[PDB]
Amino acid sequence: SRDFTPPTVKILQSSSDGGGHFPPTIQLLCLVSGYTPGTINITWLEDGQVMDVDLSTASTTQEGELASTQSELTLSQKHWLSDRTYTCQVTYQGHTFEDSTKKSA
Numbered sequence: 001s002r003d004f005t006p007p008t009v010k011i012l013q014s015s016s017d018g019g020g021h022f023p024p025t026i027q028l029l030c031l032v033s034g035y036t037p038g039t040i041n042i043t044w045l046e047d048g049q050v051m052d053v054d055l056s057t058a059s060t061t062q063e064g065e066l067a068s069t070q071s072e073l074t075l076s077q078k079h080w081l082s083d084r085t086y087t088c089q090v091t092y093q094g095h096t097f098e099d100s101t102k103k104s105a
Helices: 077-081
Strands: 008-014 025-033 041-047 055-063 066-076 084-092 095-103
Touching: 008 084, 008 095, 025 055, 025 077, 025 084, 025 095, 041 055, 041 066, 041 095, 055 084, 066 077, 066 084
Parallel strands: none
Antiparallel strands: 008 025, 025 066, 041 084, 055 066, 084 095
16 A cells, blocks of 8 residues: 655756846746646745745646646846745645745845
8 A cells, every 4th residue: 555656846946047138037946746646736935025926836747657747936036136035835735845045135
């Protein structure tokens, strides 16, 4: 007997991948898969001012008998300048987690 599977979450940052022009932002995508046969929940704990359009979302994918869900985060660099606390809180049918970044300008 061994139902369910071992959940796994990761944190990937994509800030040093920008280029000339366009406004600076942050691309923090977490890597959560294996857990749940379909997927869990996608959430990010923000601490600073989630008033703008800075939100993080994850997609659902199939990994055989497991469930691979890719999480991403998008926030304006400006906000990052004002310092904040971003964390990709991934939930599960019976589990949870959180991994991201944080700064205090």
